[PDB]
Amino acid sequence: ASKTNIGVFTNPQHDLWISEASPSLESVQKGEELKEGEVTVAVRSTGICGSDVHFWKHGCIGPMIVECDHVLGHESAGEVIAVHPSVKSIKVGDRVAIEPQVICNACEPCLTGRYNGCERVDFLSTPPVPGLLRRYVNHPAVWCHKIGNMSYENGAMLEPLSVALAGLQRAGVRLGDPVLICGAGPIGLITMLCAKAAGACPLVITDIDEGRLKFAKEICPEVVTHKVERLSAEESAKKIVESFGGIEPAVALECTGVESSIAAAIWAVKFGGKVFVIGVGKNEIQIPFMRASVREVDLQFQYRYCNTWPRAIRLVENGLVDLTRLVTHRFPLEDALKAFETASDPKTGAIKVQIQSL
Amino acid sequence: ASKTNIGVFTNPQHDLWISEASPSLESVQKGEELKEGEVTVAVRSTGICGSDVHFWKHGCIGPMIVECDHVLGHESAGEVIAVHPSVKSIKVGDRVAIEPQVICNACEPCLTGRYNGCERVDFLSTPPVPGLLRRYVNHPAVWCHKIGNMSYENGAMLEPLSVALAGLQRAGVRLGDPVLICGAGPIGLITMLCAKAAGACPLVITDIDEGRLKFAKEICPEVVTHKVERLSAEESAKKIVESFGGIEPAVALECTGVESSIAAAIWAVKFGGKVFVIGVGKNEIQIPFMRASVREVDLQFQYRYCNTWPRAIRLVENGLVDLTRLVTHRFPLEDALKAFETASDPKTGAIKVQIQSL
Amino acid sequence: ASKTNIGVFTNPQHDLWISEASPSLESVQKGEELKEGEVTVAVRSTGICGSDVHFWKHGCIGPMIVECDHVLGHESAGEVIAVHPSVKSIKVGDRVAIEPQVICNACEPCLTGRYNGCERVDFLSTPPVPGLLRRYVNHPAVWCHKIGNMSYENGAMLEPLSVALAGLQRAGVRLGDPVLICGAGPIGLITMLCAKAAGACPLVITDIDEGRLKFAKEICPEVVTHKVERLSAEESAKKIVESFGGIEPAVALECTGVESSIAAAIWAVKFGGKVFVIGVGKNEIQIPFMRASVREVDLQFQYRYCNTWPRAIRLVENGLVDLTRLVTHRFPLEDALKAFETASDPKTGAIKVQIQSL
Amino acid sequence: ASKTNIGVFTNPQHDLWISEASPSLESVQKGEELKEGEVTVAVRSTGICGSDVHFWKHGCIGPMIVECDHVLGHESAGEVIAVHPSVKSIKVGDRVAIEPQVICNACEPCLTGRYNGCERVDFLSTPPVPGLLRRYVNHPAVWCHKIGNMSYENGAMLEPLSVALAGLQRAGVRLGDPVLICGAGPIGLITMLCAKAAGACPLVITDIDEGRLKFAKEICPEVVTHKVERLSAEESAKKIVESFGGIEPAVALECTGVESSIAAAIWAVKFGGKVFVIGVGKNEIQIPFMRASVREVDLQFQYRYCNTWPRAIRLVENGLVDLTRLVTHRFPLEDALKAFETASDPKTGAIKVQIQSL
Ligand SMILES: NC(=O)c1ccc[n+]([C@@H]2O[C@H](COP(=O)([O-])OP(=O)(O)OC[C@H]3O[C@@H](n4cnc5c(N)ncnc54)[C@H](O)[C@@H]3O)[C@@H](O)[C@H]2O)c1
Ligand SMILES: NC(=O)c1ccc[n+]([C@@H]2O[C@H](COP(=O)([O-])OP(=O)(O)OC[C@H]3O[C@@H](n4cnc5c(N)ncnc54)[C@H](O)[C@@H]3O)[C@@H](O)[C@H]2O)c1
Ligand SMILES: NC(=O)c1ccc[n+]([C@@H]2O[C@H](COP(=O)([O-])OP(=O)(O)OC[C@H]3O[C@@H](n4cnc5c(N)ncnc54)[C@H](O)[C@@H]3O)[C@@H](O)[C@H]2O)c1
Ligand SMILES: NC(=O)c1ccc[n+]([C@@H]2O[C@H](COP(=O)([O-])OP(=O)(O)OC[C@H]3O[C@@H](n4cnc5c(N)ncnc54)[C@H](O)[C@@H]3O)[C@@H](O)[C@H]2O)c1
Ligand SMILES: [Zn+2]
Ligand SMILES: [Zn+2]
Ligand SMILES: [Zn+2]
Ligand SMILES: [Zn+2]
Ligand SMILES: [Zn+2]
Ligand SMILES: [Zn+2]
Ligand SMILES: [Zn+2]
Ligand SMILES: [Zn+2]
């Protein structure tokens, strides 16, 4: 702990800039602002999510509005440097991965275990709560998960790994199931790696972008890729079922949040199929209602995660998923605008951009 | 068996008229067309569903198209009059309730028990398969369910009772759950009666029609009714949550198939809530995507039923549900156009119209 | 707050006696021992559970051992008299019902919502944690549930109501299901009332005790009672299926914890049936393994509850369950040995004995 | 079709011998006994299951009693040689894998999809229904699953593969779950291969037999093996949890049917753990009731399968599971007693013994 704490900010005007941030260095060196059960973590690595890019470029997601200077990022791991005297769970020096989510333990979504839906949740990347794109953060120990000697880029990947896992779990994917992934951005790709490790088969992944498809095929040889053309939902699903052999997918994990892609997924899945939407987009979309109806197709949606962390860790420690392999670009904190620019331009060839504090 | 077999037909031109129908009387008197495992049933009573009215008035549902002279109706009970020699299960003289659905027993939806999604299904009211608005029908015994001394109007109610039950089951309604019903037409009303017998509470039912709301309150005193005004989905859900006390529903059973009503339901239910759509409407609707997303709201849809019959029977025999109480109008077969006219004009005061063959 | 705090104690020697208890009066009058988020409740009413009787008479349940002077009782409601300054949720004067369970919010069973399995749980009636058979208790606010103007005997019934609900929920009981209840002690009876409100049918309840059967039939007219005779499991299940009509139960809610009763339940339920054991008994029992096997019968077990409280409250407020009707005996705190004696002798005619502090 | 039809028989006296069998050659050459929807299959390969060995050596399983000359075997694939004119699904020359199970399509377990529990089921290896250890069998087409150019030993493995899959599915195994397998006989081994392909981790398998453990480790390098010593259930579970790291298994797939092994599994699994018993043994076993109780441990049991076939096929075609690798011994039909002797003596080094008709 020697450097001044800076952070990566955006505003309603859609600027992105670095600036000084809390806690202050001095604060952390003497453990001033450190509350009950809290620690200070030196953030070593942080992935840029579609989340962040959308907040930067647009200022909102749904009810989530950037109303003033706001620090981004929520996919992070780092080193514990200060510890409140109460903190039993964790010690100075520990590599940890940060679950960007603080829970009240008292509302219904908390007590029934669906704690991503907590009624008083602080979700770190989400306005007004400051993100993790800073050099130091104060965070409750119970949300800093020990990772032993795991690399920091892996530890940071634990968060979108968790998005994939929570999706998978609520989607109900099982060994033998034919699974469709729509979108080969970071989340699609991790979700595909996940389906594959889960024994899904056959596996198909779609995208508008050939390059991201060739990447998907390199990191998961057994998948069948499908480049999407301008077609009605109905017609797109035929193509898709062709890519599967002639088998209709049991589950579509939708990772674009885009109208046409969700429609084709509704047309593509089997009778009693599940279309699970991880992606995020417009406030309102047009849905093919009657196709969903006559097919008993379940439409499901994800809002972050819960109870994925110990399991995400296990998958990485046992080599069941290979995450680090998805980070194409690495930028130091100070160069964050370079990071966001490349993370937003697909011509870049970027998949997962990491911002680091070594 | 003395009268000529007539039926109630519609066409792409949206006519509704009575006309001669198969099997012929003589055919049934000597058991000509009677295949393996089949019986002939003298249809005693048949309810008019929204289904039928929509086929008559519009010629389709989704992929379901009336392309020529087609016999309607699928909510029926009646008396067995002829029996193939193989038929073990059922005897001449038996009151039966007819499950309007013939299964291939060989496709995946059949073998996994989701047999409403059979790939070669004959669903009797559905083109091209002739409905049950006839005097006699030939039907496999395994789809004629014994009802002992139950009334025929009850026996006929067994089918929309079944729609309610299959909804309830897949929606996951349980004792103690707060449940919203949208629409107080026949299906809403049966679904409300069902939720109530299931210990749902509190119970709210919406409609645009005050009269159908006052009826709902008469047949289910403990329900809270809610008349819908022209409001944004968001604002409508606030009203709805007000009608609940301040509790947000766990499950919305949507029985109108209408866009605005489905939207408000998405806004109304709790975090991790389920909006279950029984209703049917437009090929495409606008959905509030981000509200669904941030709330982890499951959108589900129903396509008929399976394995509801023995259970629907139990509920009626034990007095747990009171169905006959919903039939407001009774018409003889010959007067079917009167029946459909009244079943389609809400000013009629009709709830469930039955067409009979005494 | 005027009286000295006494409590109801047992020991390894199987004595039961009243004695002074913590917190002390003075402690509560000035709010000494009151920690963060805690309140002091004046316990108004407390039911004696089979739990308590077994601890008194035997000194253990499974791994739960009375090793020294221990305060019993965990089915309680009462009045809030002192409040830590932090406590937001609750105010002095509030009637509350006490969930006898303190959670760490950090272990896996806690975060996934199965918080009855918390790895560091304080369960109040359970050694070494002091029960609720005292005049005052200090308890976290988040486990004191507001009950407005509900009676204290109802508020106290909320706990075994909760045992029934958690059973029901994990057993998977639904509207239309035929349900067997084994045992007509307090828990059986509440579970029966629950099944009934849940639209279970038909309902059968067994017991060795005719009097408790006649009581069951009085409070739930529609149930069929079954007196158990000395018979093989197989033969007992035939009798049981006879009591059902000829329908085999979908679910057996077993509330005796006794070997022969569990066996007959395994024989009684349908193919793919669930036998759910609420009852507690011997460390080891003999099971009919092959019957379970060839029938795909799920054996399930309950350990208390979670997330039943707001729902238990709703059922009582809406008149869906009538609990107070089960309390046959009422004793003041000081007369607790009379209470336990009568609660343990079935010749008493007791169902639910309450101990009160008016 | 040239050879006389012989079969492998056992009797109540526990003899095993080969003898002439139905249908007769001539019968098959002219398609005499061929009913509606039926085909004749020339059985090419058939695995010996624990089932068969137990029927041979003991004469029963539970209610399943060998009462006279009975043909064994139910794990088979072979070639279609005759086809009833109705048979659409399948053609002469097709390699098929035989699902040893004929369904009535009319009882409740059939229509709800749990069709392994059919009330009028013919299960081929099970008395009185003749097994598949014959040269020709007549079987309904809908239970002969096309396998294209798959090997016959794989096609035959499809049946115990199916036992594993149905277990897995009802046990609820998912990606990331720590899974315990008890027993390294054929079923354990396939179940382990299955868990592994399902992304289970860590994986532990137990056995009394070191050789079968070394085999397990060869075919699944990433598994941790555990040799069982004579210890209390409690103490055995500690050892087991040690083999896992210190993580407690989510699911125990029990494949021995033995009392002590099931007990340790009950002690071993986590809170809310599932112990799923595939194995079969004594009519009655002693259970550790209180451990199950305080842990909310679900005990589940399997009776064969349903809807595993298309999925078992997919797993083999995509190389997700490697079955053929488990067949250690291959015997021609005529040498069946050699086959059963070796399949019953573990000193043999046998895992899966196949009996063939080339
Ligand atoms: N719900 C959550 O909790 C959660 C968590 C993480 C990410 N997300 C969301 O998941 C989405 C994807 O995340 P990402 O980081 O991979 O973003 P990304 O932009 O890198 O990936 C989106 C991909 O979708 C592809 N795409 C666009 N239109 C398509 C179409 N019509 N068909 C097929 N593919 C199409 C793009 O080419 C791109 O590769 C984002 O909207 C993000 O906000 C949600
Ligand atoms: N999915 C299935 O298998 C299945 C089975 C039976 C019926 N249905 C469908 O269920 C729907 C209802 O059936 P029904 O027989 O009761 O028809 P119905 O017209 O009698 O009932 C529809 C009700 O919706 C009310 N309504 C219209 N707009 C509304 C709004 N904005 N908010 C609240 N209420 C509104 C109407 O006033 C009417 O009372 C139909 O569309 C029918 O086809 C589906
Ligand atoms: N698992 C939990 O979290 C939990 C919570 C509450 C109560 N319980 C347990 O539930 C059980 C019942 O509680 P209770 O308060 O009603 O006790 P209780 O003794 O009042 O009820 C037991 C009943 O079982 C009857 N019975 C005994 N043998 C029988 C047999 N062979 N067949 C049928 N009935 C038989 C008795 O006559 C008695 O009526 C107790 O063992 C108690 O510890 C468990
Ligand atoms: N339920 C079904 O539908 C179904 C289907 C197939 C097989 N099975 C049953 O599964 C069981 C296993 O089948 P299999 O063909 O592998 O038989 P098998 O005898 O080859 O395997 C049993 C294994 O259990 C091991 N074992 C014995 N005692 C043990 C203990 N105390 N701890 C750990 N391991 C122990 C043995 O060494 C042996 O390797 C049989 O009982 C069989 O009948 C059931
Ligand atoms: Zn993200
Ligand atoms: Zn909360
Ligand atoms: Zn209808
Ligand atoms: Zn079918
Ligand atoms: Zn109790
Ligand atoms: Zn805990
Ligand atoms: Zn077998
Ligand atoms: Zn059957």
Side-chain angles (χ1 to χ4, degrees), chain C residues 48-51 54 61 74-75 159-160 163 182-188 206-209 212 228 254-258 260-261 277-281 302-305 343 351-352, chain D residues 293:
Chain C
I48 299 179
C49 180
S51 226
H54 205 79
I61 293 304
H74 51 275
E75 318 187 350
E159 191 277 349
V163 174
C182 317
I187 303 292
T206 67
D207 213 290
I208 53 167
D209 187 312
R212 313 250 256 208
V228 335
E254 214 299 327
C255 304
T256 72
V258 164
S260 58
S261 172
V277 189
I278 297 186
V280 129
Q302 178 176 352
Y303 187 59
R304 307 139 192 197
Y305 30 71
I351 308 303
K352 176 52 66 156
Chain D
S293 193

Side-chain angles (χ1 to χ4, degrees), chain C residues 40-344:
Chain C
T40 313
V41 173
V43 177
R44 295 264 169 270
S45 210
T46 301
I48 299 179
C49 180
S51 226
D52 309 303
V53 176
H54 205 79
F55 278 129
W56 165 38
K57 292 289 197 171
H58 296 285
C60 56
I61 293 304
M64 290 175 279
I65 323 270
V66 183
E67 291 170 315
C68 89
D69 288 359
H70 171 71
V71 174
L72 297 167
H74 51 275
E75 318 187 350
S76 311
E79 176 187 19
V80 181
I81 64 184
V83 142
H84 187 87
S86 67
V87 167
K88 55 308 152 205
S89 175
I90 246 90
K91 70 167 177 284
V92 174
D94 280 343
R95 303 202 167 193
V96 292
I98 300 164
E99 187 177 351
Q101 194 169 219
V102 191
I103 251 48
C104 86
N105 292 290
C107 75
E108 211 229 61
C110 275
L111 299 170
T112 77
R114 280 261 227 164
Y115 69 72
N116 57 316
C118 173
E119 285 153 15
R120 315 205 269 297
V121 64
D122 282 4
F123 192 92
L124 274 66
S125 204
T126 300
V129 194
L132 261 2
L133 278 174
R134 312 195 304 270
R135 308 220 233 241
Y136 328 108
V137 313
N138 282 346
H139 203 72
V142 293
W143 303 112
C144 295
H145 306 287
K146 289 236 251 180
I147 50 164
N149 313 312
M150 179 181 173
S151 81
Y152 287 120
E153 32 271 280
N154 271 328
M157 285 309 269
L158 256 25
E159 191 277 349
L161 182 49
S162 291
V163 174
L165 289 192
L168 251 75
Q169 149 136 27
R170 281 205 308 124
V173 172
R174 63 167 168 350
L175 165 64
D177 283 348
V179 172
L180 167 64
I181 319 270
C182 317
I187 303 292
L189 298 172
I190 316 189
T191 306
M192 166 195 75
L193 288 167
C194 271
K196 177 80 213 155
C201 73
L203 257 179
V204 167
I205 187 166
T206 67
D207 213 290
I208 53 167
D209 187 312
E210 288 162 74
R212 313 250 256 208
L213 289 182
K214 168 126 53 50
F215 188 68
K217 196 143 190 59
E218 283 165 37
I219 72 154
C220 194
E222 329 74 313
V223 189
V224 180
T225 76
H226 179 269
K227 179 225 174 83
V228 335
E229 322 296 13
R230 291 160 79 68
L231 309 158
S232 71
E234 169 158 35
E235 272 307 304
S236 300
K238 279 191 183 80
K239 297 303 194 195
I240 292 165
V241 189
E242 279 176 31
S243 313
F244 266 106
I247 308 152
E248 313 185 311
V251 185
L253 291 147
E254 214 299 327
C255 304
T256 72
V258 164
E259 174 167 294
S260 58
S261 172
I262 300 170
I266 290 170
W267 279 88
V269 296
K270 86 199 227 209
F271 187 91
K274 169 100 55 72
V275 171
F276 188 102
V277 189
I278 297 186
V280 129
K282 311 284 172 72
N283 282 347
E284 272 137 272
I285 65 156
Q286 219 215 188
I287 269 295
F289 180 26
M290 283 310 129
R291 176 64 187 204
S293 193
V294 302
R295 299 282 256 141
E296 296 205 322
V297 167
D298 306 321
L299 255 187
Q300 282 207 97
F301 306 89
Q302 178 176 352
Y303 187 59
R304 307 139 192 197
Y305 30 71
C306 38
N307 306 290
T308 62
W309 292 80
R311 142 173 311 156
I313 284 156
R314 270 202 295 287
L315 295 185
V316 163
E317 301 194 319
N318 289 301
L320 265 16
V321 174
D322 185 7
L323 286 188
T324 165
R325 190 165 193 192
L326 298 155
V327 180
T328 45
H329 298 253
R330 282 177 187 69
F331 292 95
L333 190 41
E334 316 87 278
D335 304 61
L337 175 72
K338 277 305 311 149
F340 275 73
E341 277 172 3
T342 115
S344 79

Side-chain angles (χ1 to χ4, degrees), chain C residues 290 293-294 296, chain D residues 48-54 61 74-75 116 123 159-160 162-164 181-190 205-210 212-213 226-229 254-262 276-281 301-305 343-344 346 350-352:
Chain C
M290 283 310 129
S293 193
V294 302
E296 296 205 322
Chain D
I48 299 179
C49 180
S51 226
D52 309 303
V53 176
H54 205 79
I61 293 304
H74 51 275
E75 318 187 350
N116 57 316
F123 192 92
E159 191 277 349
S162 291
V163 174
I181 319 270
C182 317
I187 303 292
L189 298 172
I190 316 189
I205 187 166
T206 67
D207 213 290
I208 53 167
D209 187 312
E210 288 162 74
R212 313 250 256 208
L213 289 182
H226 179 269
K227 179 225 174 83
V228 335
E229 322 296 13
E254 214 299 327
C255 304
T256 72
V258 164
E259 174 167 294
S260 58
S261 172
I262 300 170
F276 188 102
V277 189
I278 297 186
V280 129
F301 306 89
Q302 178 176 352
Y303 187 59
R304 307 139 192 197
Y305 30 71
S344 79
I351 308 303
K352 176 52 66 156

